[PDB]
Write a protein that binds this ligand. Structure first.
Ligand SMILES: [Zn+2]
Ligand SMILES: [Zn+2]
Length: 105
DNA sequence: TTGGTCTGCTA
DNA sequence: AGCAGACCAA
């Protein structure tokens, strides 16, 4: 579980992250989504909107503590979003070239 | 908010 | 495994 330098390969982006296998991909997925125009996470309990899985979960925790029901899992985003193909596409454009992001290597 | 870092378990 | 909840710092 050593530290790896993960680089975003999207056009004109110089973002990089210190990353370990155990971290998982939340921060990386959210960064890829910043390259998706007009993509927004809408709160299912009010008119709040934001970008990013981490942010919408923080909104749920702070603004809706009576809703014990949890937000979406990271492995549900691609397969249930109407723009899921675009989301998986922007992930590949951003991070696919980082070989260590592959499972089992 | 976001980054850097951390880790128990539906281990 | 790595999700996803956690901390503090900026
Ligand atoms: Zn980027
Ligand atoms: Zn809300």
């Amino acid at each position: 579980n050593k530290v790896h330098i993960i680089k975003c390969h999207f056009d004109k982006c110089n973002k990089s992250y210190n990353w370990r296998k155990k971290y998982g991909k939340l921060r990386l997925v959210d960064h890829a989504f910043t390259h998706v125009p007009h993509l927004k996470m809408k709160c299912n309990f009010c008119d709040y909107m934001c970008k990013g899985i981490r942010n919408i979960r923080l909104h749920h925790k702070k603004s809706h503590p009576d809703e014990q029901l949890t937000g979406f899992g990271i492995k549900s985003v691609v397969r249930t979003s109407k723009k899921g193909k675009d989301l998986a596409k922007v992930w590949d454009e951003c991070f696919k070239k980082n070989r260590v992001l592959q499972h089992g290597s």
